[PDB]
Design a protein around this ligand. Sequence first.
Ligand SMILES: CSCC[C@H](N)C(=O)NS(=O)(=O)OC[C@H]1O[C@@H](n2cnc3c(N)ncnc32)[C@H](O)[C@@H]1O
Length: 498
Amino acid sequence: EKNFYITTPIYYPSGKLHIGSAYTTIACDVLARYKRLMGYDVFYLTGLDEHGQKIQQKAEEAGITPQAYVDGMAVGVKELWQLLDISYDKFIRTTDDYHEKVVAQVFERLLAQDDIYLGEYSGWVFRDEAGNVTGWVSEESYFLRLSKYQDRLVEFFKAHPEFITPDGRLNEMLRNFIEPGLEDLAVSRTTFTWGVPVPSNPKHVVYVWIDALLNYATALGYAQDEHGNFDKFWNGTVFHMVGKDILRFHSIYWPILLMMLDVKLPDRLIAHGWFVMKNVVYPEMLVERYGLDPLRYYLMRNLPVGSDGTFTPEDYVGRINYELANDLGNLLNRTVSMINKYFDGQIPAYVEGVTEFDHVLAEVAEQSIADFHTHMEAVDYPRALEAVWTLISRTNKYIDETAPWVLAKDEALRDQLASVMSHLAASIRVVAHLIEPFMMETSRAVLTQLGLEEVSSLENLSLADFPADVTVVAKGTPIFPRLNMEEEIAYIKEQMEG
Ligand SMILES: CSCC[C@H](N)C(=O)NS(=O)(=O)OC[C@H]1O[C@@H](n2cnc3c(N)ncnc32)[C@H](O)[C@@H]1O
């Protein structure tokens, strides 16, 4: 159906990536996976921002060309995205030929339109003896005419109040940068060579941010021979996920660029806060030890919308223990044991309102599914997952309330025992569906133990809509590890310090 395009920032390859950059790439992966499962036609881009002064310095310290240096880095990044199961449809690098060409043409085009002019870069109280300020950047530089599109950008902001999420960040951009008056922007540099040369004046390289921002267009084939993906996906729904500290580049410079090139503006910028480790933690270490799905769950659940989030060893191990192993794992494990013991693995047909608590569980499942969808559309994963774990929580309660082991010792309550059992399986099926974007492997294994096929859609989900003639596995396997909580905390702290 409808077209949906989601992008990460293209990260600087200036080191080995920590949780920080993993966070955003996993977050966009979750959204892409979800949108696909909701029957959208989806494109998901990530990649690397390879030009710049610092990168060139690194390469010379290493004793190799810039190209070979960034080639070194790109291999490591692709390896990490492989580890974290990132389902990007394309990976873009700014040293890719097709990209560098388009950047050159765009710059030239803008110059021909007088949207870029040639002026003098200048600016920065101590004075000399003639009142001149001593304590100075000074070069020739091209300037982008942001001032000329200020009114038009203000209109855009006012007509699209949900252009940036969460609420408040759009007003911050207005107050701090736009309403006071946009200055024209220096979009070239001359103090280094590692960049896209301005054709008409090769001593200037394009400012890395203009070069970088265009990645979102060029990856689709903008201003190239094969441009089907641009016409499709750029004219559909376009989301850019970014960290708050690069919001001005994406909310001011990028929209105005797109105005000058006469193409559609994106529909949403999702700006998020910082992940802080409490002091560096590498994805591989965590994935090797406890697996991928814990990491993805942890990162997505622990960065709240509108604020920063914090990692601790205690919280990481605690959530695996309580939220995954106990809340979800034991629920599955004991659901499967009881279906075996009482109905020889055959899950009874689903009949609504057999016990007193049935209608209550059903109303909670409907609420959890609706809340999940609301929060996923807003890209609020903590709240999305909270809704999932509300259903888990109420399903564990439902076991306590119906007391299957009491029902089983009375032959007149067989229909009730059966309804408990079908309601447990049905509940866990819904849960395995809701978590799939976050925890693909966990989802599959949960469903396998219930004798169900892996998820294929998230449309039209409900508790009652359960397949007939289902048989659970004869023997259950734990989906999560049983941790030595003190040892694992001490292990994580050891890896961080050492
Ligand atoms: C056209 S987009 C150009 C982006 C630019 N190259 C850049 O900026 N690169 S970066 O390597 O600095 O990556 C910054 C982004 O990585 C993510 N990031 C890095 N560290 C963290 C962190 N600790 N918590 C959350 N996100 C983080 C956010 O998405 C930031 O916006």
